[PDB]
Amino acid sequence: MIPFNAPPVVGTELDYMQSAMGSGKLCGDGGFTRRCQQWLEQRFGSAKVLLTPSCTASLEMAALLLDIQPGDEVIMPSYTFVSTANAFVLRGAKIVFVDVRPDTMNIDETLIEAAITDKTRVIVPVHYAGVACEMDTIMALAKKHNLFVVEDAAQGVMSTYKGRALGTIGHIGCFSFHETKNYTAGGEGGATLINDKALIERAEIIREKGTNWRDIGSSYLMSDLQAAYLWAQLEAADRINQQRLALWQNYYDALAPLAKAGRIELPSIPDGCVQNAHMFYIKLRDIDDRSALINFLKEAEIMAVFHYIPLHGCPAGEHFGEFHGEDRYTTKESERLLRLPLFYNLSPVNQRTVIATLLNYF
Amino acid sequence: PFNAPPVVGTELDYMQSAMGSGKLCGDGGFTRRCQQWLEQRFGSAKVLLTPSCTASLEMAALLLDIQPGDEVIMPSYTFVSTANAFVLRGAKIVFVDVRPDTMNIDETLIEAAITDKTRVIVPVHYAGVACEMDTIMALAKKHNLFVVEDAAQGVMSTYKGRALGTIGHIGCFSFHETKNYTAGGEGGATLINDKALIERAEIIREKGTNWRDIGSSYLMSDLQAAYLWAQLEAADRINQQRLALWQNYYDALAPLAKAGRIELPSIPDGCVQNAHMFYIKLRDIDDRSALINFLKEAEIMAVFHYIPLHGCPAGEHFGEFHGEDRYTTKESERLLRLPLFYNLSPVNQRTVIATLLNYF
Numbered sequence: 001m002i003p004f005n006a007p008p009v010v011g012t013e014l015d016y017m018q019s020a021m022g023s024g025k026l027c028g029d030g031g032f033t034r035r036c037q038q039w040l041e042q043r044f045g046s047a048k049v050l051l052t053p054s055c056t057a058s059l060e061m062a063a064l065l066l067d068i069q070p071g072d073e074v075i076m077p078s079y080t081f082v083s084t085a086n087a088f089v090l091r092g093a094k095i096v097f098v099d100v101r102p103d104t105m106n107i108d109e110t111l112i113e114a115a116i117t118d119k120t121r122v123i124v125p126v127h128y129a130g131v132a133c134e135m136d137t138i139m140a141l142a143k144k145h146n147l148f149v150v151e152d153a154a155q156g157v158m159s160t161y162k163g164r165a166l167g168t169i170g171h172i173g174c175f176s177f178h179e180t181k182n183y184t185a186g187g188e189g190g191a192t193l194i195n196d197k198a199l200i201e202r203a204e205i206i207r208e209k210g211t212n213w214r215d216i217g218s219s220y221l222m223s224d225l226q227a228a229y230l231w232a233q234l235e236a237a238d239r240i241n242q243q244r245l246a247l248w249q250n251y252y253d254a255l256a257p258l259a260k261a262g263r264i265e266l267p268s269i270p271d272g273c274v275q276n277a278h279m280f281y282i283k284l285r286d287i288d289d290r291s292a293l294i295n296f297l298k299e300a301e302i303m304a305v306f307h308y309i310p311l312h313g314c315p316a317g318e319h320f321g322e323f324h325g326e327d328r329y330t331t332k333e334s335e336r337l338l339r340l341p342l343f344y345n346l347s348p349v350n351q352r353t354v355i356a357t358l359l360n361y362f
Numbered sequence: 363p364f365n366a367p368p369v370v371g372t373e374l375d376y377m378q379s380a381m382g383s384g385k386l387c388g389d390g391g392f393t394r395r396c397q398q399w400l401e402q403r404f405g406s407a408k409v410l411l412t413p414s415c416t417a418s419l420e421m422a423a424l425l426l427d428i429q430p431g432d433e434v435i436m437p438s439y440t441f442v443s444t445a446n447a448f449v450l451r452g453a454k455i456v457f458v459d460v461r462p463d464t465m466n467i468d469e470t471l472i473e474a475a476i477t478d479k480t481r482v483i484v485p486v487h488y489a490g491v492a493c494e495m496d497t498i499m500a501l502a503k504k505h506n507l508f509v510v511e512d513a514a515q516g517v518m519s520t521y522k523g524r525a526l527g528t529i530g531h532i533g534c535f536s537f538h539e540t541k542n543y544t545a546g547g548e549g550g551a552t553l554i555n556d557k558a559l560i561e562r563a564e565i566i567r568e569k570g571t572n573w574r575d576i577g578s579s580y581l582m583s584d585l586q587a588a589y590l591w592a593q594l595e596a597a598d599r600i601n602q603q604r605l606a607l608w609q610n611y612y613d614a615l616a617p618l619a620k621a622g623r624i625e626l627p628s629i630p631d632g633c634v635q636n637a638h639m640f641y642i643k644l645r646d647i648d649d650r651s652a653l654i655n656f657l658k659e660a661e662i663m664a665v666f667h668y669i670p671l672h673g674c675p676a677g678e679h680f681g682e683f684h685g686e687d688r689y690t691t692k693e694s695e696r697l698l699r700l701p702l703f704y705n706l707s708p709v710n711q712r713t714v715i716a717t718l719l720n721y722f
Contacts, residue, residue, distance in 0.1 A: 006384050014378070021374075026367050026547025027539045053413035053548075056579035082573040089576055090424075179387040187386025187583035188413075209442040213676045216449050219416035223547035223586060316573045 002354065004303040007179035007187070008344045010236045016228040028221020029212075032228040039234050040191060044165035046173065048200050050207055051227065052190035052220040055154045055176035059087035059124075061192050061220055062150045062172040064206050065199055066122060068093050073119040076152075077107040078312040078323060079330050080126045084152050085311055085321060088122070095321030096120070097312040102329045103268035105337070109134040109141075115324040116145055125170075126152040129267060130275040132161035135169045150174065151193070155278040157182050158241045162272040171196040177230060182240060182276055182344070186229035189222055240344050241276055247346055248277035254355045255282065258362055280340045281307070287335040293361055294338065300357045307339055364663045367539035367547070368600060368704040373592045380588035388581020389568070392588040399594050400551060404525035406533070408560045410567055411587065412550035412580040415514045415536035419447035421552050421580050422510045422532045424566055425559060426482060428453050433479040436512075437467040438672035438683060439690050440486045444512050445671050445681065448482070455681030456480070457672040462689045463628040464488060465641075465697070469497040473505075475684035482508045487516035487526050490636040491629055495521050495529045502530075510534065511553070517542060518601045519636035531556040537590060542600060542638060542704070545590035549582055600704050601636055607706055608637035614715050615642065623722055640700045641667075647695040653721055654698065660717045665699055 020032055033051055040049040052058040068074075070092025076084055078097040085095050096115045101108045105128045112123065123142060125133045142149045149169075153159070154176035156166030167173025177189025194203045206217035233240065252266060259266045265283035269275055284290040290306065297304045310330050312323035323330075341354055380392055393411055400409040412418040428434070430452025436444055438457040445455045456475045461468045465488045472483060483502055485493040502509045509530030513519075516526035517535050527533030537549030554563045566577035593600070612626055619626040625643035629635055644650040650666065657664045670690050672683040701714055 007386055009381075014381070017377070018374075021369075024366060025539070026544060028548055030547070053417070054579040054581070057413075060578065082569040083579060086569055086573065086576055086578065090578070179385065184386065186585040187390070188388055188581060189583075209446050210674070210676060213442045213446065213671065213674050215676055216446055216680070218420065218446070218450070219414045219443060221414065221548055223549075225546040225585060225589065226583060229585065311573070314570075314573055316570065316575055320576070 001301040002303060002341060002350050004305050004339065004341050005180050005343045006345050007184045008182065008233055008240060010233050010240070012235065013229045013232040016232040017225060020224045020228040026224050028219075028223060030224030030227060032224050032231045033222065036227055036230050036234060039231070040175070044168050046165075046168045046193045046195050047197050048194040048203070050192045050194070050203065050220065051222045052192055053222050054188055055174050055178070055190040056083035056087060057218070057220050058174040058190040058192040059083055059150070059152065060090060061203075061206060061218070062174060063088045063091045063093065064216070064218075065172065065203055066148050066150070068122070071119055072121050073117055075112060075115050075120060075123045077126055077330070078310045078317065079105055079128070079308050079334055080152065080311065081154070081308070082311065084124060084126060085317070088124070089320045093122070094119070095311075095317070097317070097321055097323040099325055099328050099330050100333070102333050104128060104131045104133075104270065105333065106131065106133040109137040111325055112138065113141055116141075116147075120145070120147060122148045122150060124150040124152055127156035127159065127166050129281065130155050130159040130278040131267070131269055132156065132159060132166055132273045134270070135161050139169065148172070155181065156276065158237060158276040160274045167193040168195055171199060182244065182278055183230060183233045183237070185222070185233070186226035189226055189230060192220070243344055244277040244342065247342060247351060248280055250351060251280040251340060251342070251355070255358065263362055277342070280342050281337050282340065283333070283336045284338060285336060290336055290338050296361050297357060302354055302357055303341060305339055306334075307337055308334055310334055364665050364699065364701050365540045366703045366705050367544045368542065368593060370592055370596045370600070372595070373589050376588040376592045377585060380584050386584045388579070388583060390584025390587060392584050392591045393582065396587050396590050396594060399591075400535075400553070403597075404528050406528045406553045406555055407557050408554040408563065410552045410554065410563060410580070411582045412552055412567075413582050414538070414548055415534050415550040416443035416447060417580050418534040418550040418552040419443050419512065420450060421566060421578070422534060423448045423451045423453070424576070424578070425532060425563055426508050426510075428482065431479060432481045433477055435472055435475055435480060435483040437486055437690070438670040438677065439465060439668070439694055440512065440671065441514065441668055442671060444484065444486060445677070448484075449680045454479070455677070457677070457681055457683040459685055459688050460690050460693065462693050464491050464630060465693065466491065466493040469494040469501070471685055472498070472501060476505055476507070480505070480507060482510055484510040484512055486512040487519070489627060489641065490516050490519040490526075490638040491627070492516065492519065492521035492526055492633045494630070499530065508532070515541065515638040517636065518597060520634045522632040527553045528555050531559060542604060542636060543590065543593040543597070545582070545593065546586035549586050549590060552580070603704055604637040604702065607702055607711060608640055610711060611640040611700060611715070615718070618722055637702070640702055641697050642700065643693065644696045644698060650696055650698050656721050657714075657717055662714055662717055663701065667694065667697055667699060670694055
């Protein structure tokens with residue numbers, strides 16, 4: 001069967017992992033760890049980058065870094081991963097959900113200010129599908145109300161917004177290194193980006209409980225074995241990105257006649273935003289047309305899957321959070337979004353099979 | 363070298379297997395296998411692997427629904443994560459002095475610190491040596507307290523037949539390179555012995571339904587699991603070899619211990635260790651630092667252990683020491699950990715002993 005995703009295989013991961021084993025150091029904060037850190041810092045322009053076991057932990061570290069007390073309201077979309085909210089709820093924060101914009105499925109930068117209260121301190125924007133949000137409106141809103149901006153660029157690796165890299169535009173940035181991402185770091189991984197220099201000294205403390213105790217913290221240490229796996233794929237960062245971009249536009253150029261026919265809808269990439277081709281989604285009227293395609297693709301041995309059940313609709317989202325405004329584009333558009341098979345090791349032969357099955361359905 | 367990460371020689375073979383499967387993320391193939399291995403071998407109801415023991419400790423505090431104000435009893439002579447994991451839930455830490463023979467929490471000094479706010483007592487198995495669990499379990503049962511086992515060093519070691527980590531409601535394993543089983547450098551394991559705590563355990567490890575409830579990503583990569591699975595395969599071989607090297611230390615350092623010059627580790631009846639470390643107790647902080655500096659001159663790396671948390675600026679802020687600090691501070695400043703690991707050649711072990719006896 002043709003899966004929806006397969007972990008990035010450069011073919012050099014095995015060689016770099018033997019260097020970590022040969023060095024005799026496999027624990028966190030080792031050699032290849034700091035090398036991946038130096039890589040991300042200079043390439044993206046961030047002041048400091050620390051590697052975590054997961055993007056979830058990075059988000060948890062951020063909520064711990066900004067010193068969140070129970071009662072603090074954090075604004076975020078409900079069309080995101082559960083880790084985005086749970087990381088802040090753990091600190092006692094209440095979540096204020098805001099509807100998304102139907103073109104990019106990102107948080108509407110115009111509806112944010114209405115959700116701001118005296119209890120609000122943090123706003124965490126999610127760069128869905130690698131497509132950056134309107135940062136030149138959000139950062140101004142933060143500046144206007146003295147708020148912190150934590151970027152959830154879990155899918156925004158090798159993505160930029162008007163030049164600047166994602167995870168860099170904001171006080172804190174969070175990268176993901178799961179096997180379902182552009183760079184897998186051995187299956188599990190994450191990265192905390194500390195762009196604000198005034199948050200660095202404490203970030204080092206909470207990274208290793210107390211000054212590597214002085215204060216609370218955790219063990220946000222990713223093994224050096226995983227580091228070597230990541231460093232191997234950062235070496236082919238431009239090769240991986242360009243290949244995924246090639247496979248991405250192949251989907252777009254073949255589904256464009258259907259989009260211009262009004263049958264389906266294609267992803268929108270705003271001016272100034274450069275994606276990384278993390279995923280390719282389409283829109284199918286309702287939830288019955290999407291399922292009809294899902295079952296159709298499954299019959300052709302092709303794996304397709306939707307994305308993100310709205311957090312505000314979940315029973316735990318009704319307890320720790322609240323959807324401000326009108327649920328206009330969040331729930332509806334989520335039930336029609338379908339993700340197509342897209343990964344680095346995807347052969348062009350199989351992609352033609354997927355596309356042929358799509359056009360066959362329509 | 364004080365410690366070198368355990369190398370069986372078959373780690374590479376099992377990692378290629380994980381890579382060939384096209385799945386390296388958490389809860390993968392080798393993840394289940396490691397969890398199945400630990401459950402049968404030790405007798406645990408449910409074992410879940412974590413990125414670290416610290417994560418497991420935090421997962422434990424989140425599992426028992428620790429609210430701000432709740433008191434947690436533990437020795438101050440423990441790793442920072444043992445206390446830091448509970449403070450994250452807003453708990454207050456109540457430190458209890460140790461017993462000088464095993465450096466474990468004194469089972470007789472615990473009950474004097476129990477209040478109405480006390481909810482969890484977390485014992486720490488030092489050097490793989492078990493705490494007096496029969497007394498501790500009877501304590502908790504009487505005062506309705508949870509027992510979270512911090513067996514970060516007690517893996518493969520037992521207490522009166524029962525493996526450490528399975529004696530109490532929640533246990534915690536560590537898989538660091540400085541431990542007996544490294545799991546690719548980082549790794550941990552939460553042991554859910556209480557069956558009534560199993561259902562909520564799997565939820566908080568994967569946020570919800572596998573949202574539904576608070577939780578985190580306590581998932582460890584299948585790459586590390588593949589590394590760990592190779593280590594658990596040769597569990598007996600590693601254990602016995604480390605136990606062999608441990609006996610060589612005790613046999614040679616016994617005359618000094620009987621002379622009164624130093625003090626060797628004490629192992630209570632019914633307690634079987636796993637030889638995580640061989641500590642000698644000098645006379646003071648000056649005698650220890652003198653040996654450390656002497657061994658360093660002979661290019662031999664020795665090291666002490668963590669400083670009592672109740673003296674640290676965070677411990678006096680987030681916790682309180684109950685009773686008189688009679689042994690914790692003093693014994694900590696005279697304890698010295700000798701070089702000990704699985705790949706320690708017989709040639710280099712004698713060299714250390716030759717340097718030790720030469721100092722005395």
